[PDB]
């Protein structure tokens, strides 16, 4: 997701992370095995340096892996 | 407590006004029906014992478990209660019918009845059922008397129903 | 307790008073020091309006003190229907969402995130809405912006105590009610050191979030239906936290921000630490 | 609120008994009376205003000094109040006629009458005159039972006031 | 003894107040009704006997076995009693009509009914039939309000008995 | 949620039985009225804005103090709320009217409403008043429409009333 | 119950100690003021009726609606209550003033007051107002008496205020 | 807690009336006396210790056997307690003087005195001596009203103990 | 009758306990005050008459219309009464001072005040003026505590009347 502006109101240096998405990370609210969306196999979210550690760790434990990290700007 | 007349008053009071002529005409006509109204009540009271007796029989024929060991109408003690309760509800309904207002029945009996029944473990469902059974029997009498001047009681009959139903609903 | 009649036979609004009993007020007829009975440390009577004044004074003139008074009409009312929260409903924001579908997620998000609390047009947040619908923000990220907004702090966090703000958060961000004091304590500490922003993050960051309504699903009420690792009491708590539809969390009401879940109830489900 | 109908219900309820013949007889009494009562109310309701003017006025004639400066009757506010009050009394009386019991009167007007009056230094006397003057006027527009009813209630207040 | 008149007095008395319009209305009801009530009583009083015979009889038809030897219906003494009793019930019913309240019935017949009946093993059922049979006969000699009144009271007992 | 049909079902279910033929005939008839029913709803929705606008004007003409400093409808913020609320209640009422059942109204809207109002200090009396004011205006439209086939809507009109009244009562 | 003296004692007790000499000197001086203290009280009690009467007049001049049909001070019955209440609060305040301690006031009087007011629907705001109105009038007398030795009562006057205010606050 | 001031409030409160002249008179009494009371307290507070030693001691002289092994007076723990106790009594007496009422005494010492003493087999007698011995010493350091006050309270306990 | 002395006895009696120091303190208060109280009484007693004349008079100035024919103030009988009454108030206030409590005032005058006054249509207002006028005069002959006392009691009535 291309950042239209700095997403985060609280301000630090912001990094764009692109992740391969497990079904767990974004299960659809459906009966049977939850399926992450087809359209976005790779969600891409800008993240403040402060929240970057948590976000990564949570991504890691969930199947999905970091395709690539890029500074937001 | 409250009744049709008193009620209208109270409303009028908060507006701060004399009664509207329109409003009088509600009461004026209400008066006219009195005689019918009364006989209706009289019919219930006259047949009371029966109404209940009847309803009970039917209630227990249907829900045989109530009267089985482990059920709620067993043993005697409980059974007695259950009969007593039915009666009460009836009594209140009648009261309302005369007043021409639900208030008395709801405040004196219904408000909190459900929860009581719940706490005890009485199945509210069945209670409601009984109330209906009663309703039908009661109407039966109200609507089919002998030696009364023949005419139309429907208006009253329906109001009667409603009262029974408020009961059924709030209990249920 | 349940009251069985709303009004006295003579016309009169019954009020239910609750007091802490005292040995003077009622005592066993034994020899030795006078004791009340333990199970009635908090006693409750229903009194007509007329006798209310005298009854209350007597209670107070003895060692008694009045925990609370409440009209018997409000009391002796149904526990709130759970019809609408038994099955929440659930809103998904698809990618390439229509103009309308984005709207409907926004509304839902306000409703859940703010409690039935009304949000005025001036209160609403154009900027964060603007981000949703051109992409760039998730539903989960929007939710994090709301709980960062002043509107959110003004209502839930600046009026009440942190202990209440916690459960108030538990409800908005997860359907669940809180389970065990441990949870309340951890949030209180996190708030002291990290501060308000970290606390908010930790709900949205937590595994229950994402495991349920992970991303791009507006959060919905999980409680009221059986959840994993959820004490039973929690289910009763939910009935205290959630009163009806068209019941809210309001700072606006008299003594607006109190604690629905008495601290002794939390301690029941699990005491330790 | 005390009306015939409410009372018998109450009595029945206290004993825990169905409404039997006894009570219905009573009810019958009320509602039969109503026709007269109702008539009276229509008459008062219509002439209300005029009765009020006349009354307020009367009071001043009866107690000239009230209109002097530094007194209670003096300055419009007070006059307005005085009007209001008398109108309120009339409204309750009309209500009572229709309700078929003193109920409305008792609860609005009578209960706490004394202390109110004491704390604000309203002299019962005044009100009374108002009423009396009224009674006199009513004694023209009405006749027979309708009249009788009107009186009863008007008086009931006189007695309560005094 | 509970009659309309006694009750309103009682209610007035409890509150500690004079009889006001409310109560008189009620009283009025009792008096206007009386004319019908009184009529009914004159009718029952006259046909008393015949009603009684018919009733007693009925009971036996309804419960043949009672007349068999070793039973309660058997032997004249018992029959005499049975007659007496029904006659007593009738007298109280007439009394109530006139008094204009259940009072007389309550105090003589109803209070203690159960225990008496239990200790002597009188089956309510019997009495009931008696009454019903009566009600049926009365349903000829009377008509309109007079009738209605008679019924009310007769029933009141049925309900008390059952 | 619930509505006329579903309701009858549920009842039937607890008895454990197929629907009684009598009961079908309630629903059968209900269907027939549909068209009328619908137009009723349509009329409300069509006039919504107005209904409220109107009722409000009247409400404030009566209880001047609400809009005075210290009153409950002052200042703007509060006023807004009060308007909003009125509308909501209306919305629900309409819903009910279509469903042919009070439920939706009771559960979503009325349930807890009184207590809320209490806690806030909102004077329940006035709220109730407003609801009635609305009622009358609303009926006004339901009952006097334009371009509709002429017939009798009373049945519907009364049911409408009842809904409004349940509202008034539970709030009050 | 409690008062200035008793209080200090209690504190001392929990430390487990005899009273500190410093602490005695609080009480010693408190005694000295007695005479002033007393006259203060006397002034209130002497003027009681008036204090209230006055405050009320002003209260009703301000909040006209209270005395209008539909308001909280209407009808008579209610009005009476409202007067009675004011008085009570006053009574307590006086008590406190003599004791030299808030407690008595808080425990007998203020405790539960708010909640009552809420349940009834009495507008707490207005109540608070009345309390203040009273306060000012009362001080008026305390501070301007007849036949008293001239001197400074401020200390007492302020303490008086505080009591009134605790009242106002807890009610509000 | 019972002091002069609390009582008059209580009495006033019960009847539901304002503090009138009657009560203030009483209050005044308490305040006038205080000066003497206060003095007495300062005197006891200062000599506390010495009084205590002397008392404890006395008791032993009076009841030699207590100090023998296997008795209560024997072994330091007990002696410590014995000291403590007497000191507590003195503290309450000082508190009472200042409070201007028996209140403090009643609630701490007196209420439950008996049962405590019974269950632990403390003989009232002992305490008493302690007190008496005290009273005697106090009868030197004080004089006039101050003295009188001290006595009153000391005694009050004697009476409660016995 | 409520005086300081009676009350403490009462309270002592209720609890079932001896008069202890607490109550005596209170009593003492009453006695110390008496000297002032007594003085005040001697002063009122002496000037009685003159106070009375002045008061009665005042009332008439304040309410001229009373002296007009057909009113209450009119015709000697009434004037005599009016005098008497105020003299009764004067004698009883004096009694209270001496008794050292409101007691005498309460049962003799305050009790039943309202209803008496209602049934005979005596307007409290009047009395009040009388008192006020008095208070003003007394505010010359007396000074210091004696004065203060006199006031207290005079007022106590004002409050009771209003
Ligand atoms: C009978 C149709 C069904 C039934 C009834 C039932 N009730 C109880 C117990 C109670 N019944 C009541 C109800 C009332 N008491 C009142 O005063 C009023 C008017 C306000 C009502 C309607 C109450 C409160 C009790 C408890 C007091 C008592 O026992 O007298 C029982 C017995 C259960 C028990 O454990 O008490 C029963 C059986 N339940 C059924 O099974 C029927 C379907
Ligand atoms: C309606 C459920 C059934 C019915 C009623 C009915 N009643 C009347 C007329 C009267 N009914 C009474 C009855 C009473 N009046 C009283 O004062 C009392 C209590 C003491 C009663 C019980 C009276 C007096 C009348 C007037 C005429 C008469 O002789 O009955 C009517 C006729 C219409 C009217 O209101 O007058 C009707 C229809 N009759 C039925 O067939 C209905 C099933
Ligand atoms: C003693 C081992 C420990 C202790 C006890 C203690 N209890 C109280 C006060 C109360 N205790 C009770 C207990 C009961 N009341 C009952 O009726 C029953 C049986 C049915 C029990 C067991 C109650 C109710 C009270 C409060 C009122 C009363 O006096 O009855 C105290 C005093 C508390 C106070 O501050 O008033 C104490 C000390 N606490 C200890 O110190 C011990 C560890
Ligand atoms: C220290 C002076 C005394 C003391 C404190 C103490 N507190 C706890 C535990 C808690 N304190 C709170 C209270 C709060 N809730 C809030 O919202 C706020 C901010 C407005 C506070 C202050 C809470 C929630 C807890 C629970 C656990 C936690 O740490 O958050 C303890 C620990 C004991 C326990 O948890 O059972 C202590 C020691 N108590 C003392 O002994 C000191 C005299
Ligand atoms: C208007 C007729 C009257 C009035 C209303 C009023 N309401 C509030 C505040 C609230 N009103 C509600 C109402 C509802 N919540 C719901 O969800 C529903 C049904 C779904 C209803 C009808 C709620 C939730 C609130 C609290 C949140 C809010 O900010 O509104 C107020 C404002 C209260 C305040 O003190 O801020 C008012 C004024 N009051 C009047 O003056 C009218 C008589
Ligand atoms: C008219 C004969 C005289 C008069 C009267 C007057 N009344 C007041 C003040 C009040 N009057 C009442 C009376 C009622 N209010 C009610 O709610 C009811 C029951 C429905 C009654 C009968 C009350 C309660 C008041 C107190 C305050 C208020 O205005 O509501 C005044 C003002 C006196 C004052 O100082 O408060 C007056 C003057 N006016 C005249 O000119 C006549 C002498
Ligand atoms: C008639 C249907 C049946 C019958 C009756 C019968 N009755 C008794 C005994 C008593 N009957 C009564 C009844 C009353 N006496 C009263 O004073 C009143 C109130 C006014 C009533 C209703 C009483 C009290 C008795 C018991 C004492 C007595 O002997 O009078 C009997 C005899 C029973 C016995 O054990 O001796 C009988 C048989 N006889 C029939 O043929 C029918 C079966
Ligand atoms: C009743 C409040 C007033 C009224 C209504 C009325 N309507 C009809 C008939 C129809 N009305 C509609 C309307 C709709 N049907 C739908 O499906 C929808 C939503 C898409 C609407 C708005 C229709 C289609 C009919 C049938 C065709 C026709 O109009 O003739 C009637 C006639 C009764 C009947 O349908 O059997 C009536 C009475 N008209 C009044 O007089 C009332 C004031
Ligand atoms: C007057 C300034 C305001 C006002 C007062 C008011 N109060 C009531 C009713 C009650 N007030 C109380 C008060 C107390 N409860 C207590 O415990 C104490 C302290 C010990 C007090 C002072 C109580 C108990 C009641 C209820 C019972 C009663 O009969 O009074 C009302 C009437 C409420 C009703 O609807 O009946 C009123 C009016 N309200 C106002 O309008 C003023 C602003
Ligand atoms: C304070 C608001 C005003 C004020 C007070 C003031 N009073 C005194 C002195 C005394 N006042 C009293 C009054 C009483 N003592 C009692 O025992 C009783 C109850 C029966 C009362 C009512 C007494 C006895 C005294 C002592 C003698 C005297 O009157 O002078 C003073 C003097 C200072 C002092 O502390 O002694 C003062 C200042 N005077 C003001 O200026 C205030 C308006
Ligand atoms: C001294 C004259 C004799 C003596 C006494 C002694 N006392 C105890 C034990 C207790 N004494 C008390 C007394 C009080 N405790 C209180 O809380 C108060 C109120 C302030 C008093 C007066 C109590 C309660 C105890 C019981 C337990 C305790 O630990 O205090 C003992 C010990 C006996 C025992 O079995 O514990 C003794 C010996 N000691 C002497 O030397 C004298 C003979
Ligand atoms: C003086 C301000 C006005 C006045 C007085 C007056 N009084 C009466 C009648 C009575 N006076 C009293 C008063 C008292 N009697 C007592 O026993 C006591 C307590 C010790 C008091 C205060 C009583 C009881 C009466 C009524 C019966 C009686 O005759 O004593 C009247 C006569 C009124 C009448 O007869 O209806 C009058 C006129 N007279 C004036 O000029 C002033 C207006």
Numbering used by the authors:
A (entry chain A): 1 to 73
B (entry chain O), F (entry chain F), G (entry chain U): 1 to 172
C (entry chain M): 1 to 273
D (entry chain N), E (entry chain R), H (entry chain T), I (entry chain P): 1 to 162
According to the publication:
Cyanobacteria and red algae use extramembranous antenna megacomplexes called phycobilisomes (PBSs), composed of phycobiliproteins (PBPs), to harvest light. A typical PBS contains an allophycocyanin (AP) core—two, three, or five cylinders of (αβ)3 trimers of AP—and a set of radiating rods—stacks of hexamers formed by αβ protomers of phycocyanin (PC) and, in red algae and some cyanobacteria, phycoerythrin (PE). Here, we reconstructed a cryo–electron microscopy structure of the >10-megadalton Gloeobacter violaceus PBS, with diverging, conformationally mobile bundles of rods composed of stacked phycoerythrin and phycocyanin hexamers, stemming from a pentacylindrical allophycocyanin core belted by auxiliary phycocyanin hexamers. The bundle-shaped morphology is maintained by linker proteins, including the multidomain linkers Glr1262 and Glr2806, which are unique to Gloeobacter.
The reconstructed cryo-EM structure revealed three pairs of C2 symmetry–related rods stemming from the top of the pentacylindrical AP core (R1/R1′, R2/R2′, and R3/R3′). Although two PC (αβ)6 hexamer stacks could be confidently built in each rod, the density of the third PC hexamer and PE (αβ)6 hexamers only permitted approximate placement. We located the conserved rod linkers, CpcC1 and CpcC2 (22), which contain pfam01383 and pfam00427 domains that connect two neighboring PC layers. The density helped unequivocally localize Glr1262 on the first level of PC hexamers in the rods, consistent with its predicted position. The three REP domains (pfam00427) of Glr1262 were identified at vertices of an equilateral triangle, which corresponded to the cavities of three PC hexamers that formed the base of a rod bundle. (C) Topology of the two copies of Glr1262 on top of the core showing relative positions of the repeat domains REP1, REP2, and REP3 that attach bases of the rods R1/R1′, R2/R2′, and R3/R3′, respectively, by clustering them as two rod bundles. # indicates the C terminus of the Glr1262 chain. Two copies of Glr1262, each with three REP domains, are necessary and sufficient to cluster the six rods symmetrically into two triangular rod bundles. The REP1-REP2 arm (residues 280 to 350) of Glr1262 interacts with the C/C′ cylinder residues, and the REP2-REP3 arm interacts with the B cylinder of the AP core. In the absence of a CpcG homolog in the genome, a rod-core linker found in studied cyanobacteria, Glr1262 apparently plays this role in Gloeobacter. The bundles of rods position multiple PCB chromophores within 35 Å of each other, which is sufficient for interrod EET.
